[PDB]
Amino acid sequence: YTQVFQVTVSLGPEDWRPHSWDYGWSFCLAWGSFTCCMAASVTTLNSYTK
């Protein structure tokens, strides 16, 4: 979708091309959902070692 949003702004969308492109704000927070998957995964494989 960033590959989408890069290419669509590269078209300069039909009548809406911004001087923004300030990403998210929840997409920086959706990034934080990824590392919260990762911190959840390292501790439950740590229970697998015991």
Binding site: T2, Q3, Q6, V7
Partner: peptide, 29 residues
């Protein structure tokens, strides 16, 4: 970014290969 993001497909293709080799190890288990 566009020239890089195409390399993600074989990068995730290794991540599927990370799963595909690991699951048949359970058949060796």
């Amino acid at each position: 970014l566009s020239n890089v993001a195409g390399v993600f497909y074989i990068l995730v293709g290794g991540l599927g290969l990370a799963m595909l080799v690991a699951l048949i190890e359970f058949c060796y288990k």
